[PDB]
């Protein structure tokens, strides 16, 4: 019965009903996105109201529509055709993946330039890629892929160890056009397999590993209703399920004694990006929005018992609709389940002669997805003493090239002529705050180091600062290591028991932000990216950083657009958006299938509670 | 056989008897520190010589001495009696713990303080706090410690919720003179108890947690011989014990193929400080070298099956030696264990059809310690993709003091009129690398941004940059983790199959170096705390940042001292010194036991490899 319940293959059943009747679900439409609309503020009416966005595109060349649809009412709430020119294209379908290859395979063009390099036409695989804006007047909207070539010297065979140098090839996939190939020289296509199941480049399996058993005797300790709410050592909140975002946490609350008290009314990481920094024509243009672009959801993985989740695990199947608006399940697509994690407090005292030891553990929530070359793993965690976290693991194989006789400044050498350009791989994570309520607040703080002097003598002093960012317009803020910047989010009129209003600390890695230089393409459509810290007012159609429609949109659009409106954030219904990243120089040990990397951020309770909130915890 | 095996109670019996019978241990004598000394450089002599510092304090006041003594010729090597006003008194004693407590329960000026708030001289605890050097003229060549008081209502209840504000005491432990009693004003004792095993502060236990078994049906993967030699997928170490810096890490190794390849030679923490930042001149003084000063090594906690190391845990029990030079063990003193740490790699391919799944352990080593209110997990994490780690976690009771009426710059409020001024933990690790052996130097990374423009019109690129340190005096950097900034250690001689130096890449975690004013005492005597990097050339004798006596030195001993040399550190025998620390705002949810709070740093391989270390790594 409740509002935020996953979708259901039953749903998306009616939601393909009640397009074909309607007249918009044709033999030429292609469902691009389908989700489920979180609940409108103000819910408290009880009054069910199911609705869909349905993004839909036409392969005939007529213009895309997006679409409200009321499941349980059985109507169309709105139909707006969509300029693509204006407001940006489609995401990519998955049955664009194909196409690419298929309309080169016939181009003479093509076909000379695979001929000089004495490579089978049968052999080459194309990469599908986004093609972002660039000088290209005639692109303009039009639905472009660009494709980068690798060879496969066999079905099986990794075709990242074999790419084509040289040579891309821009493809209309609507009219079924190749508009531009572009073939800047030969370079020797790097002739080492990476093949990581081939015995020749393992060498014998260890057989040193003994096993390591994970088991819960009486089952685990939180429990699921309703199909995904959880509840699991005073924690309470909703797993929800989209196509573009994937795991989104819904109603994120703590029960401390009487109270359910809220934390996060919403958190998804709500874009990614991946920019390359190769300033080769080849691939200089290259900027791929795992999220926005391709939607992370529709390719997320099924993951199996043992190998991918240890221990005791539930999981959730989510459905998805198809291209044409059938339901599917992607089984196992959620796991979830508890984890030791060490020691949670330990005193021994000299005087009291008292020695107390307590077990943490955490609640691990988390979904895997690949998208062509990479894979990446989504991990939320809940720990015993409030600690909220995400984790981000990047694995996969590099995105590769020929490494330059000479060598490169931006490109690193793997194996013999195998080069993989520099890049990074940015996340955004919005954050719906609740802190106890709507009425939050954020305030920078900063470590304030004093000068020795009167009322410092000895100068050991130091103090903080908390600056509270009260309208839009001042609240794009960067990171400051050195000073220990963090901020805090927290509701002015709630206060603990010494009179403080409650709040969370959000604890950021500091990492780099985009590297691109401010006035290129990249750093006006993800200028989510350039910036460690945003907050917005809430609103219903405020969804990501870099709007609605990423695709070939000529930027500006999300983040910057919003803040503008210079709203009032002090003591409001508030959104936080934290950008976080990693940057990618890559290791001779990346090659040939790259070991887990990671990338996150924490928030923590910061006088929320009245004192320790696992005083509780019993002594194992 | 192997001389970098564990002290032995034999060993320390035979050094009493060799001290005894040179007359270097009569009744008056104490032995503040004993510790093996490791093998000099060349040891490849395998003549052992199993040789042992020993500091000597005097409790008559005759002058301290350093002693070396050799076990296994019986003999003593040499001994020199010190002069401390010069180079710093001898660490705290445990049996020093009392006396300052009792020596000022029979002075009058003490007592009328303590009739002036009505408290029972029977219920006052006195820490015994180390004194650092400031204005005190008769303090030079005395052996002092500093006094503050906190109440026991009744014998197991916790002293720090009940601060006696406004009163510090200092004492001469050798003469048993109260040199100062000060008394700014009477500040009221805070009343709230902070009993955390009492039911009326814990209110029911919760019973909703449900078991976690961890077992290795089998057992585990690490083999330990010669006491102290690990084995683990395919790392070789020796695990070390100190009775002042803890776990010592020598001989890190990792078999490559045919070959064993040395990158560490001897891993520790060697110093570790807690400086305060509260002006008032009752704690203006406080900063406590944990490691220095009070030995963390001597009060390792016996470590319990289930509730501190959970799992399949083989321990090693240390020996240290009492103040007597009698063999003490510290039963079940360290935990060893392997661990599941989730996905290695992982990667789903579009064209070749391979799914590949791999999972993560780490080899965990560990230690926990109590120093009056703190305690500290010392961890160790070996991984298998090469990767070293580093964590500590921080707990205990926070340092309490009043919290003033009108409120406090330098403060926390945790309870009604209880306060825990602010105050930092930072760390110094001491690597001693050996990178492919000892030719090692160092580069310092940082990330480089490039200008849209010519050979780069999309404004796309970024690079990096490497810079080799060459000398001592320009050895001595900051982190900066806006520009990623890491550092290298790499071995100039010994190449990876593309012709790069192999490496490793140190990656910090970019916390706050030491606050205070550097014109302050606390500068001076933990220099090594104001940066994040050093690096200096080996020797024999440079062991600790902050010199052999830390206690009552005046500062400027260790590493500012010993990069005066300006010594050639490019392609040499070089040590990595890495700062690191939290910086502790005290929140309401670290009263009044608080959870663990975590810091630390890795090493990654960094072209060490000529691929990834773990395509060997089985199916599960
Ligand atoms: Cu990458
Ligand atoms: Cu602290
Ligand atoms: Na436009
Ligand atoms: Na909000
Ligand atoms: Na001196
Ligand atoms: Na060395």
Not at 17 to 32: D, Q, V, Y
Not at 214 to 236: C, L, M, R
Not at 319 to 326: H, L, Q, R, T, Y
Not at 490 to 514: F, M
Request: charged residues 25%; glycine residues 8%.
């Amino acid at each position: 019965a409740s509002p935020f319940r996953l979708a259901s293959a039953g749903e998306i059943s009616e939601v393909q009903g009640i397009l074909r009747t309607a007249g918009l679900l044709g033999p030429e439409k292609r469902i691009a996105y389908l989700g489920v609309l979180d609940p409108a503020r103000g819910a408290g009416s009880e009054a069910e109201d199911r609705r869909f966005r349905v993004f839909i595109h036409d392969v005939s060349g007529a213009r895309p529509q997006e679409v409200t649809v009321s499941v349980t009412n059985g109507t169309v709430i709105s139909a707006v055709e969509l300029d693509t020119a204006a407001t940006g294209e489609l995401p990519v379908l998955e049955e664009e993946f194909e196409v690419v290859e298929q309309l080169l395979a016939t181009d003479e063009r093509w076909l000379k330039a695979l001929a000089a390099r004495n490579l089978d036409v049968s052999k080459v695989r194309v990469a599908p890629l986004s093609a972002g804006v660039f000088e290209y007047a005639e692109e303009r909207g039009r639905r472009i892929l660009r494709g980068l070539a690798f060879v496969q010297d066999f079905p099986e065979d990794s075709a990242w160890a074999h790419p084509v140098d040289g040579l891309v090839a821009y493809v209309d996939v609507v009219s079924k056009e190749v508009t531009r190939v572009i073939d800047t020289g030969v370079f020797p296509v790097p002739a080492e397999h990476g093949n990581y199941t081939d015995p020749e480049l393992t060498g014998p399996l260890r057989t040193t590993q003994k096993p390591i058993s994970i088991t819960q005797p009486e089952g685990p300790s939180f429990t699921v209703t309703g199909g995904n709410h959880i509840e699991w050592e005073k924690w309470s909140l909703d797993v929800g399920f989209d196509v573009r975002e994937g795991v989104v946490l819904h109603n994120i609350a703590f029960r401390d004694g009487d109270r359910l008290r809220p934390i996060i009314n919403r958190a998804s990481i709500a874009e990614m990006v991946v920019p390359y920094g190769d300033p080769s024509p080849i691939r200089s243009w290259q900027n791929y929005f795992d999220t926005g672009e391709y939607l992370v959801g529709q390719y997320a993985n099924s993951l199996e018992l043992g190998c991918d989740c240890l221990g005791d695990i539930t999981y959730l199947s989510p459905v998805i609709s198809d291209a044409f608006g059938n339901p599917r399940e992607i089984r196992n697509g959620i796991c979830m389940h508890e984890e030791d994690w060490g020691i949670l407090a330990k005193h021994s005292d000299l005087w009291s002669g008292i020695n107390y030891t307590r077990r943490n553990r955490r609640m691990v929530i988390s979904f895997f997805t690949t998208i062509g070359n990479y894979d990446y793993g989504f991990y939320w965690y809940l720990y015993l003493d409030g600690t909220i976290e995400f984790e981000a693991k990047a694995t996969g194989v590099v995105f590769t090239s020929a490494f330059p006789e000479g060598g490169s400044d931006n490109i690193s050498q793997l194996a013999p002529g195998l080069g993989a350009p520099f890049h990074q791989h940015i996340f955004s994570a919005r954050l719906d705050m609740a802190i106890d309520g709507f009425t939050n607040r954020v305030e920078e703080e900063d470590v304030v180091r004093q000068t020795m002097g009167p009322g410092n003598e000895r100068g050991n002093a130091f103090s903080r600062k908390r600056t509270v960012l009260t309208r839009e317009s001042e609240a794009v803020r960067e990171a400051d290591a050195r000073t220990g910047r963090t901020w805090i989010i927290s509701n002015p009129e709630s206060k603990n028991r010494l009179n403080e209003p409650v709040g969370y600390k959000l604890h950021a890695h500091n990492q780099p932000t985009l590297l691109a230089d401010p006035g290129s393409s990249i750093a006006r459509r993800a200028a989510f990216a350039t910036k460690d810290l945003w907050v917005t007012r809430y609103a219903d159609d405020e969804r990501y950083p870099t709007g609605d429609f990423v695709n070939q949109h000529s930027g500006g659009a999300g983040l910057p657009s919003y803040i503008a409106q210079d709203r009032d954030i002090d003591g409001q219904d508030i959104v936080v958006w934290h950008t976080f990243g990693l940057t990618h120089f890559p290791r001779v040990e990346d090659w040939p299938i790259m070991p887990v990397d990671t990338v996150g951020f924490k928030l923590r309770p910061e006088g929320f509670f009245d004192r320790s909130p696992v005083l509780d915890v019993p002594a194992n």
